[PDB]
Design a protein around this ligand. Structure first.
Ligand SMILES: CCCCCCCCCCC(CCCCCCCCCC)(CO[C@H]1O[C@@H](CO)[C@H](O[C@@H]2O[C@@H](CO)[C@H](O)[C@@H](O)[C@@H]2O)[C@@H](O)[C@@H]1O)CO[C@H]1O[C@@H](CO)[C@H](O[C@@H]2O[C@@H](CO)[C@H](O)[C@@H](O)[C@@H]2O)[C@@H](O)[C@H]1O
Lengths: 48, 367, 76, 257, 180, 433, 618
């Protein structure tokens, strides 16, 4: 999450929008799933 | 059932934190002035009878399952003059200390985490006229309800909100059988920028902006018996999420959700009035109501009945509430119980909310 | 007080020191019975079957001497 | 409406309120840099209040609120309005009310939270109640002292993966040696036994019966002799038994078999 | 000796040596434990006339265990330093005068487990623990019913083996108690 | 394993573990036993086995380490394989009695029944066939109790042999019962397999290991697949798991009846001996804090009559909210006649609109009319005064208490689907973990 | 780059049933039929390609409160996919589960079924694939089977299909259980070898040319094989069968919301009458009579917890103070207790078949002998009688000197309990128990002293007789042989304490338990015509004997004025126990024929203890 919240040096917003590096949210993959406010709202995918 | 509930962050700001108001069906915008009158209507803090007061309130969650999961509130008001008052409250919903263990060794340092959610607000209330007063409150809300794991960040999410309240209390007017008193109040709460739990500007949730309008009348008998009947109407100032579709199949839903989430809070407050296929007849459904009657004997015994009803299509939290209050010398003890009447399991069932307030300082006369 | 709860990875190991476990009930923060084992009679418990849509889940275990002890745990 | 104006409702006990900060830092290299340290605000309440009193010799108030125990049978709230004996209403009870019934077919509820009222018309007593029940029924059967527990197992419900024969010799002798029980037609007496399991605890301790960690190679056919009534391939897994055995067909299990 | 027993191989048979060419022993055992405990190694407890009391105690223990199944020496060492200070400031003025009771508890526990081979230097650090803690509390009675207790607990646990991580827990704040 | 982590039978040569091995865990043993004057060892012990490590050299630059391994006997393999004899080493004739720790004789009853569908304690031959003619006395099947069929009943109360048994389970603390663990062990390793196969066998052409050669009577009762396959694999043979071990055991521990609850409300305990309600002050005593019930009636203690104790425990969690309402009339006809009309209604609030089987909600109503009449009877006192050596003056009394109650049950409208009271056998929302 | 948004090993509660269901195939592990079981969710399968998953009409997502927020729970259905080569004409594939369901209180069994054709596969036609529910005790011998042809949802256009066209009411199963009961009654008269049975032995009323009305349901096809019971459903099964003669069908079927509806809410009645009278502190008579009808129960009892049986019970207890019939000059405590009672329980459902009402089965029998057998075997009759003479003793006089030979020190306790039972399991059950206890106790009040401080002695005669005869449920013609258990015992334990010296203290105790074996012949066979009062005062052969001896000695060594500081003290506990071996040991016979006596067992124990203070001062 450091790549998404606290923008590190050397990383631009273009590198964070490629569909292979962008953050995945639960509404994108599970639009019909209701998550309590304040809980995890992102899908922590396993990238190979 | 519930069709298209409003998805707003930090929902615990909309939960009653004091026993007195919770026994009145979660209404305090038009009731008599009290120390707990910060979450509901700070504008009547200038109408308080005592110089200053402090209060601690407790609301347990899942009483049958386990303790330490509760919402507490600490409020402190102080009026320097007869026209102005400074108040400050702190609400804290917490699951208690939770140990993290991944080993069975008795000698193993265990990390203790307390996923919590608190809101600290301070309000200034100024009595403009002899019977009318205004109040401005600033609130900081922090949420740390998640636990830090691998690939999961438990960084707390913070936000600010502004509350504008107004309270009117007419003088004691005599009638044929009693000398009652009229009260009215309005309060716009949670006006601030979106709170982002993921710390991303693209994924941000609206603050639970609320609008409460209430009015009440007090019948006074024998100079030592009071019966205050009050009614409050509550409406959220957040646009309704799109339902079936308001333009393939999932493309319309995705576009509608993207359009809904790409709305500023300033614009969203004005967009709250409408944004639905239904007209004013269906728009009236968005307003929940609460009707309460409080009986006061010798200003030391209080018996409160309340009925709070939300729409069946959103929220769907309809219940009755009983409450009792006792003042011995300077300490008021309030206990409230809730009888649910909705098809959904209310998490406040079988819960006896408690409140304990100490009032001290000089006494100010009430007009 | 005699019990050593532990959540290593998608499992909840329950060990009762010098006592016998009778029943273990696991609740989510909503109050739903995501797991129930009415009959164990063993010192060591290993659930390893929770779904845990949220992180904080409540477990309630009673021993052979009817000692209701509840300990909140975070699911890992 | 009330006998007097005196109110002696008195509180007792204690209340505590803790406000502070909790800072936790765990040096886990796998954690995110944003999870370097967690600084949170801690607020705790320890309400331990009781409240006993009367209001105008007509209201009796009894409350006990303590947030350190099960609220189902420890947090109590009782309001009792008792008018004069000449009034139609004899008792109004709010809170922890009870509904005792002097009947066997219709049992009442002892722990109820709600409204209970009592009216008396000359000689007819009407007791009404509307509440929530905080208890559950439980029925037990006791014969000659202690309770009786009934079990209904099935054949497939045996205790699996817990009981093991020490050898095929014992397995094939079990049925014959127990034909005339309680007499056991077997002179075998296990004098020493050591059991080794896969070590997933990976913990070293002196109080756990010593630290006896050894490399183990377990053979399936070790100590296996032939059986008169059982064919060889049901006793050993070795593909060819030519010269494998060097003892009589009914030799007891031993390393030299 | 938790479990010694007679050996059947120790008989009148001509076979006297085992596979390891060792003469059979009449009594055979698996583990032998030498436990030593200074509980405490020292305790200095002294109170001054200024209401200051100091209680310091050093405790130590060893749990040597020789196992003949693997011929390994498991040595568990433990050291514990405890310090406790109690002071009472007299006539502290906030119109409000009260005494301040200050209690400080410092602790330092070091535990270590080694597995030693006899034939060569293979001292294995099986487990370890190093936890120090400091708990300060200060009481102040504003009245007969209202009391305030300032608390500060600081516990740091270092890592001895890599399976555990250093853990710092710092709780601090105030506790207000009102009695009726 | 430590000595407290397992037990073993010195005579029958089997072991029982404190914790079962439901995973790929490997079990190895080394045991030495004595038969008369002979001593047999089957494994390698740490006392007589090879050294753990042998080191050659003085410094690590030229040191050679030889780590030697003990040779043991495998009881459980790393990879499960039912086709190997190591699978047969696991006992499948041991049954764990639920919540049993100290089961003892005179407080333990066990029976074997055949549910098809009702529980029947004997085996009938399949239609068109009959049991083998002229069976041995120990191999009786025709009209024979199942305890005698499975060799669990051949002794009297004092463990002495009897012709047809005493009809009760043979309690041997070393052969058939594990007292400290509350386990029941059959006298044969495959009681529901080879034993009943031999009981029903009609010739030498029928072999137990070849299920194609059965005689249409072994095709019904012989559960071979529960011994040649795992329990999950044996689930495929559903028409064989028809034998029910039904029994009871008495748990006392200490003096007093454990009602399984603490700090129960006063007056919430009702005790019934043989259909009559006992007196809370005369027939029994209740310690509410410890939840103990002590029977004070001298005749009832040594009576063997099953006593039903009902109580209301408030130490419940995760239960549906119960709304209890109703009224009770207490009209008084005369100074010695009371008529009551109690009416009550108890409703439950389900968590959701789908009530799964077992978690059912009730909407019950019960209304009853009762009459109490207590009168003084000087006639009985005067009659007793005519007895030889009785000259008392205490009044005699009579009391008639009648009560008629009607129960009308119903289900809450919350747990109703399409207007009907719905209970979901399986909504398929709990599957697929 | 491959980003797994989710990666799980998914396990199901419905097991893929391996093994053939039709006898025509006999080789299930062939035919290349890919049978898969999975789930379809509203949260994960809402955009499915053939048909987007939608809830059945009327089904709403469950709503809960997680933390001040309304959360809609997931709605899921069980998907069964048949592909590869396709099912044969009558071959079927099903998934099963082990449950325990009692559906006797509900009238309707309901379920939602959906059918669709696999993509890139030949289209499945209507009335070709059939959804069947098979429930009971097993899937091969005893089960109810309910089959329904499935209407295939049309695909090809938009993937989003309305719920009414997905979960069609034509494919929905709605079965009345009275149809199952009637089918079971009809199949009772159908022999297992009759031609009306299929190859698998399943009896379908719709395929019976001699039966009018079929199975009673025009949409569902009902079948029964081996007398199952829906009052206890141990096994449940849902699957797909085929109907296409010259085809191999492939498709996906969704099962959703298998439920029980139309609860039977008929009430019940109960009546209790109590007559309690006390007569001049001498007589106490308490008569209780209870009569409860079917369906009565408590408020909190569930659907299956209510009493499915008529109960008629009474109990009379009489307490008499017989000692008051004697003059009070010599007080006698002689209480007499006589407690009789009996209960008759008639079940709502016949114990045989466990799911047919007793009245319905009795009416639909047409056989007087069978009707009588069914009526008689259902009755559960119990009768208890208890006679008690516990506490028989003579009270001490107001001013009397205690003596060792005084009869007032004795106490007598007699108890007789008799239970007669007969129900569906036992045709006759007799349980007699007699306990006679005589207790004696005395405490003496004021070279070495030889007068004991106390004397303890008590004897116990405990006789128990159980006769248990199991019934033949088919006919009341012969029955099983009765089984006899007897526990005639004679237990006596005595003890005494001695205070030989001011320091010495010797407590001795000895218990002996003997077994009376007068009811056995020369061989190990009990005698049927034996009475429990035959020889009551009979001492049997010894069975167990325990002795305990505790000595305490303070060692008064202080008499010599050289060792006046020693405070020595010695304790010695000696225990002995002789245990008689079972007859299998004392009369063991080897296969060679020789009879060997293996002897009894003896145990001895010492507990020596020495404690010394040894004050070095003085
Ligand atoms: C953000 C909140 C800050 C915290 C505020 C604490 C205020 C403490 C003042 C104690 C108090 C308030 C009751 C509060 C109790 C709630 C405690 C909650 C516990 C939660 C678990 C109790 O006083 C009552 O209690 C009795 C105690 O038994 C007292 O008895 C006696 O008690 C002792 C003599 O008073 C004797 O020693 C004892 O012998 C007697 O018996 C009585 O005097 C009285 O009935 C009385 O208030 C009074 O004291 C002064 C002191 O300067 C306060 O000055 C204020 O300070 C700032 C205000 O902070 C303001 O800025 C400032 O303008 C203002 O000058 C005023 O308030 C004033 O009115």
């Amino acid at each position: 999450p450091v790549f998404y919240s606290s923008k590190p040096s050397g990383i631009s917003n273009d590198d964070l929008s490629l569909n292979t590096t962008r953050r995945i949210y639960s509404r994108e993959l599970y639009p019909n799933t209701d998550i309590a406010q304040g809980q995890i709202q992102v899908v922590n995918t396993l990238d190979l | 059932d519930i069709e298209r509930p409003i998805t707003t962050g930090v929902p615990f700001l909309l939960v009653a934190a004091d026993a007195r108001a919770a026994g009145l069906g979660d209404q305090g915008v038009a009731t008599s002035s009290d120390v707990f009158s910060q979450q509901w209507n700070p504008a009547k803090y200038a109408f308080a009878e005592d110089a200053q007061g402090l209060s601690i309130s407790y609301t347990p969650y899942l009483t049958d399952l386990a303790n330490d999961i509760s919402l507490g509130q600490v409020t402190y008001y102080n009026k320097i003059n007869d026209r102005s008052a400074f108040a400050g409250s702190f609400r804290y919903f917490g699951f208690g200390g939770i140990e993290l263990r991944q080993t069975g060794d008795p000698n193993e340092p265990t990390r203790e985490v307390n996923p919590n959610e608190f809101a600290l607000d301070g309000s200034y209330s100024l009595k403009l006229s002899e019977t009318f007063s205004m109040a401005v409150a600033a609130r900081y809300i922090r949420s740390n309800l998640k636990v830090a794991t691998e690939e999961i960040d438990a960084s707390a999410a913070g936000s600010f909100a502004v509350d504008v309240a107004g309270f009117y209390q007419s003088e004691e007017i005599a009638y044929s059988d009693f000398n009652g008193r009229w009260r009215a109040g309005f309060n716009i709460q949670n006006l601030g920028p979106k709170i982002s739990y993921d710390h991303d500007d693209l994924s941000a949730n609206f603050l639970p902006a609320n609008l409460r309008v209430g009015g009440g009348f007090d019948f006074i008998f024998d100079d030592y018996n009071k019966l205050g009947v009050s009614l409050e109407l509550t409406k959220l100032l957040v646009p309704t999420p799109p339902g079936p579709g308001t333009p393939s199949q999932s493309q319309a839903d995705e576009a509608n959700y993207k359009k809904y989430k790409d709305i500023g809070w300033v614009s969203g407050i004005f967009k709250s009035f409408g944004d639905a296929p239904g007209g004013f007849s269906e728009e009236l459904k968005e307003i929940t109501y609460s009707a309460a009657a409080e009986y006061m004997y010798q200003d030391a015994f209080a018996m409160r009945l309340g009925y709070y009803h939300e729409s069946p299509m959103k929220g769907a939290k309809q219940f009755f509430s009983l409450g009792a209050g006792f003042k011995y010398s300077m300490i008021k003890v309030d206990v409230s119980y809730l009888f649910s009447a909705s098809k959904v399991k209310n998490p406040l069932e079988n819960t006896l909310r408690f409140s304990l307030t100490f009032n001290f300082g000089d006494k100010y006369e009430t007009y | 007080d005699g019990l050593l709860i532990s959540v290593k990875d998608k499992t909840i190991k329950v060990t009762s020191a010098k006592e016998n476990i009778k029943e273990v009930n696991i609740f989510d923060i909503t109050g739903k019975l995501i797991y129930n084992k009415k009959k164990v009679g063993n010192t060591e418990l290993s659930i390893s079957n929770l779904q845990s849509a949220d992180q904080v889940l409540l477990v309630k275990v009673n021993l052979e001497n009817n000692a209701q002890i509840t300990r909140k745990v975070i699911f890992k | 409406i009330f006998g007097s104006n005196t109110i002696d409702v008195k509180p007792t006990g204690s209340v505590e309120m803790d406000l502070g900060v909790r800072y936790t830092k765990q040096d886990n290299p796998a954690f995110s840099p944003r999870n370097r340290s967690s600084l949170t605000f801690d607020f705790d309440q320890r309400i331990s209040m009781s409240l006993m009193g009367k209001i105008g010799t007509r209201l009796e108030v009894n409350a006990n609120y303590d947030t350190q125990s099960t609220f189902a049978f420890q947090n109590l709230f009782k309001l009792a309005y008792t008018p004069s004996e000449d009034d139609i209403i004899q008792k109004v009870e709010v809170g922890n009310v009870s509904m005792p019934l002097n009947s066997t077919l219709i049992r009442g509820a002892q722990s109820l939270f709600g409204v209970k009222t009592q009216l008396q018309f000359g000689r007819t007593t009407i007791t009404g109640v509307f509440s929530e029940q905080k208890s559950q029924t439980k029925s037990v059967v006791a014969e000659n002292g202690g309770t009786v527990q009934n079990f209904d197992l099935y054949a497939l419900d045996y205790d699996n993966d817990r009981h093991f024969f020490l050898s095929q010799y014992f397995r094939n002798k079990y049925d014959v040696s127990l034909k005339n029980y309680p007499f056991i037609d077997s002179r075998v007496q296990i004098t020493r036994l050591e059991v080794w399991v896969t070590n997933k605890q990976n913990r070293v301790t002196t109080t756990g019966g010593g630290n006896n960690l050894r490399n183990i190679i377990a053979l399936q056919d070790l100590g296996e002799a032939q059986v008169s009534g059982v064919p060889d391939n049901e006793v050993v897994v070795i593909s060819s038994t030519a010269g494998f055995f060097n003892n009589p067909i009914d030799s007891p299990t031993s390393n030299t078999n | 000796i938790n479990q010694f027993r007679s050996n059947f191989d120790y008989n009148s048979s001509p076979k006297v040596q085992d596979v390891n060419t060792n003469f059979y022993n009449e009594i055979i055992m698996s583990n032998v434990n030498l436990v030593e405990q200074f509980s405490p190694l020292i305790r200095m407890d002294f109170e001054l006339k200024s209401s200051l009391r100091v209680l310091s105690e050093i405790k130590k223990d060893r749990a040597l265990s020789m196992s003949f199944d693997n011929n390994l020496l498991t040595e568990v060492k433990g050291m514990e330093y405890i310090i406790g200070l109690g002071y009472r400031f007299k006539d502290v003025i906030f119109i409000i005068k009260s005494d301040i009771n200050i209690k400080a508890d410092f602790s330092l526990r070091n535990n270590e487990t080694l597995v030693r081979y006899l034939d060569y230097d293979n001292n294995q650090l099986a487990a370890g623990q190093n936890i120090w803690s400091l708990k300060l509390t200060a009481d102040y009675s504003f009245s007969k019913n209202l009391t305030a207790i300032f608390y500060y607990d600081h516990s740091f646990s270092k890592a001895v083996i890599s399976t555990s991580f250093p853990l710092t827990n710092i709780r601090s704040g105030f506790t207000l108690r009102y009695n009726f | 394993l430590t000595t407290n982590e397992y037990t073993f039978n010195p005579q029958l040569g089997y072991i029982s573990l404190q914790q079962r091995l439901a995973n790929d865990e490997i079990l190895a043993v080394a045991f030495e036993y004595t038969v008369g004057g002979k001593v047999y060892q089957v494994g390698e012990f740490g006392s007589d086995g090879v050294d753990a490590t042998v080191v050659t050299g003085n410094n690590s630059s030229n040191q050679a380490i030889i780590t030697q391994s003990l040779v043991l006997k495998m009881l459980k393999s790393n990879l499960t394989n039912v086709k190997n004899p190591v699978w047969n080493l696991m006992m499948k004739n041991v049954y764990q009695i639920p919540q049993a720790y100290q089961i003892k004789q005179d407080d333990f009853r066990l029976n074997i029944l055949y549910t098809d569908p009702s529980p029947i304690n004997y085996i009938t031959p399949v239609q068109g066939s009959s049991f083998p003619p002229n069976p041995a006395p120990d191999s009786k099947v025709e009209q024979t109790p199942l305890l005698n069929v499975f060799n669990l009943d051949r002794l009297n109360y004092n463990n002495d042999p009897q012709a047809g048994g005493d009809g009760f389970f043979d309690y041997i603390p070393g052969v058939t019962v594990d007292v400290q663990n509350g386990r029941v062990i059959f006298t044969t390793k495959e009681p529901f397999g080879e034993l009943i196969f031999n009981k029903l066998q009609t010739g030498a052409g029928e072999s137990y290991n070849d299920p194609t050669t059965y005689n249409a009577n072994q095709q019904k009762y012989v559960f071979r697949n529960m011994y040649r396959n795992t329990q999950a694999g044996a689930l495929q043979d559903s028409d064989k798991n028809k034998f029910l071990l039904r029994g009871k055991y008495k748990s006392s521990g200490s003096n007093g009846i454990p009602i399984g609850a603490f700090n129960v409300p006063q007056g919430s305990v009702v005790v019934t001996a043989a259909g009559r309600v006992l007196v809370e002050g005369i027939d029994y005593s209740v310690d509410y804090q410890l939840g103990r019930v002590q029977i004070l009636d001298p005749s009832l203690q040594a009576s063997n009559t099953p006593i039903e104790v009902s109580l209301e425990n408030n130490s419940i969690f995760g239960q549906q909210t119960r709304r209890f309402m109703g009224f009770n009339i207490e009209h008084k006809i005369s100074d010695k006649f009371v008529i009551g009309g109690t009416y009550l209604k108890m409703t439950e609030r389900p968590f959701t609109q789908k009530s799964t089987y077992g978690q059912e909600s009730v909407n019950n109503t019960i209304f009853g009319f009762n009459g109490n009449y207590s009168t003084e009877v000087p006639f009985l006192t005067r009659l007793a005064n005519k007895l030889p050596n009785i000259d008392t003056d205490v009044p005699s009394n009579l009391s008639i208490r009648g009560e008629v109650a009607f129960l009308r049950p119903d289900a809450p409208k919350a747990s109703d689907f399409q207007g009907e009271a719905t209970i979901y056998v399986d909504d398929f929302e709990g599957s697929q973990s | 780059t491959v980003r797994f948004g989710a990666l799980d090993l998914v396990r199901g509660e419905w097991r893929r049933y391996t093994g053939t269901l039709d006898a025509n195939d006999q080789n299930p592990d062939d035919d290349g039929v890919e049978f898969d079981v999975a789930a379809v969710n509203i949260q994960e399968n809402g955009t499915k390609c053939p048909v987007n998953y939608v809830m059945p009409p009327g089904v709403q997502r469950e709503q809960l409160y997680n933390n001040n927020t309304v959360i809609n729970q997931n709605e899921q259905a069980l998907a069964v996919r048949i592909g590869g080569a396709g099912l044969q004409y009558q071959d079927s594939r099903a998934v099963f589960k082990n449950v325990s369901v009692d559906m006797r209180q509900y009238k309707k069994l309901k379920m939602f079924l959906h059918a669709e054709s696999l993509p890139n596969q030949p289209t499945l036609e209507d009335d070709e694939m059939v959804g069947f529910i098979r429930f009971g005790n097993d899937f091969t011998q005893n089960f109810y089977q309910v089959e329904i042809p499935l209407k295939v949802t049309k695909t090809g256009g938009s993937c989003s299909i309305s719920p009414d066209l997905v979960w069609m009411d034509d494919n929905s199963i709605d079965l009345a259980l009275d149809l199952l009961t009637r089918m079971k009654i009809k199949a009772m008269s159908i022999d297992i070898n009759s031609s009306k049975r299929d190859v698998n032995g399943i009896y379908y009323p719709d395929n019976d040319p001699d039966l009018e009305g079929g199975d009673g349901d025009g949409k569902l096809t009902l079948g029964i094989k081996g007398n199952p019971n829906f009052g206890l459903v141990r096994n449940l099964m849902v699957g797909v069968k085929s109907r296409a003669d010259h085809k191999d069908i492939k498709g996906e079927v969704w099962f959703n919301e298998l439920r029980l509806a139309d609860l039977e809410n008929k009430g019940g009645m109960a009546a209790i009458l109590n007559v309690d009278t006390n007569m001049a502190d001498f007589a106490t008579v308490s008569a209780t009579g209870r009569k409860s009808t079917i369906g009565f129960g408590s408020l909190e009892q569930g659907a299956n917890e209510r009493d499915r049986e008529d109960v008629q019970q009474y109990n009379i207890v009489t307490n008499l103070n017989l000692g008051k019939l004697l003059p009070k000059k010599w007080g006698i405590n002689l209480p007499f207790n006589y407690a009789i009672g009996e209960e008759v329980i008639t079940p709502e459902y016949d114990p045989f078949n466990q799911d047919i009402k007793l009245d319905q089965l009795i009416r639909e029998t047409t056989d007087q002998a069978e009707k009588d057998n069914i009526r008689t075997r259902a009755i559960d009759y119990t009768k208890r009688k208890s006679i008690n003479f516990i506490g028989v003793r003579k009270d001490r006089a107001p001013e009397q000197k205690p003596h060792v030979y005084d009869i007032e020190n004795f106490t007598f306790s007699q108890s007789y309990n008799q239970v007669e039972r007969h129900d569906y399991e036992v045709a006759d059950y007799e349980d007699e128990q007699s306990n006679s206890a005589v207790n004696y106790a005395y405490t003496f009040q004021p070279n070495f002293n030889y007068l004991p401080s106390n004397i303890s002695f008590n004897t116990n005669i405990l006789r128990q007789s159980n006769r248990q005869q199991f019934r033949e449920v088919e006919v009341e013609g012969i029955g099983l042989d009765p089984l006899y258990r007897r526990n005639f015992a004679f237990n006596y334990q005595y003890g005494f304490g001695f205070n030989l010296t001011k320091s010495l203290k010797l407590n001795y105790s000895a218990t002996s338990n003997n077994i009376v074996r007068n009811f056995l012949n020369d061989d190990n066979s009990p005698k049927e015509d034996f009475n429990i009062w035959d020889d009551y005062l009979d001492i049997g052969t010894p069975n167990q004997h325990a002795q305990q001896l505790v000595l305490n000695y303070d060692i008064p060594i202080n008499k010599i004025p050289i060792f006046g500081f020693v405070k020595a003290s010695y304790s010695y506990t000696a225990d002995y126990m002789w245990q008689r071996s079972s007859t299998a040991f004392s009369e063991y016979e080897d296969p060679n024929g020789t009879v060997y006596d293996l002897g009894n067992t003896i145990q001895n124990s010492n507990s020596n203890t020495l404690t010394t203070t040894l004050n070095m001062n003085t």
